[PDB]
Amino acid sequence: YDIQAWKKQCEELLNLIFQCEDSEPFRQPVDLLEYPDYRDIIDTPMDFATVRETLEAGNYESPMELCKDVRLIFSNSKAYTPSKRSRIYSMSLRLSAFFEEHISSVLSDYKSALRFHKR
Numbered sequence: 374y375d376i377q378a379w380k381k382q383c384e385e386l387l388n389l390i391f392q393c394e395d396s397e398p399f400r401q402p403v404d405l406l407e408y409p410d411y412r413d414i415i416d417t418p419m420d421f422a423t424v425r426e427t428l429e430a431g432n433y434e435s436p437m438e439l440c441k442d443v444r445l446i447f448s449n450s451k452a453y454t455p456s457k458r459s460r461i462y463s464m465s466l467r468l469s470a471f472f473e474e475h476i477s478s479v480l481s482d483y484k485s486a487l488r489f490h491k492r
């Protein structure tokens with residue numbers, strides 16, 4: 374029932390994501406010199422360094438907010454991909470599955486802790 378536990382759990386999950394090779398295209402903002410039309414398709418860029426920095430600055434109030442930004446990294450990759458078979462998009466699907474598998478307990482524990490707080 375620790376209402377604050379999600380933060381370190383998210384830091385550790387981001388550490389695992391950064392250790393994974395599949396995260397390399399998503400660790401920093403998409404390079405507009407490499408993909409000059411990126412902002413014509415993507416309205417809200419997002420990357421794992423921005424998520425980590427937001428978390429470390431104390432600018433997420435809940436793990437749901439962090440989860441919304443991580444999911445935006447994946448939806449941007451899906452919206453920008455020219456093919457559902459593309460390399461970068463394929464890496465995003467594996468990273469997404471790993472992220473969802475691990476964030477589920479973080480979200481559950483946080484929501485359970487908040488319900489206990491308001492019992």
Ligand SMILES: C[C@@H](CO)Nc1ncc(Cl)cc1F
Pocket residue numbers: 389390393395467468471472
């Ligand atoms: C924790 C690590 C242990 O080797 N396994 C993984 N880490 C990251 C991804 Cl995206 C997929 C994995 F299977």
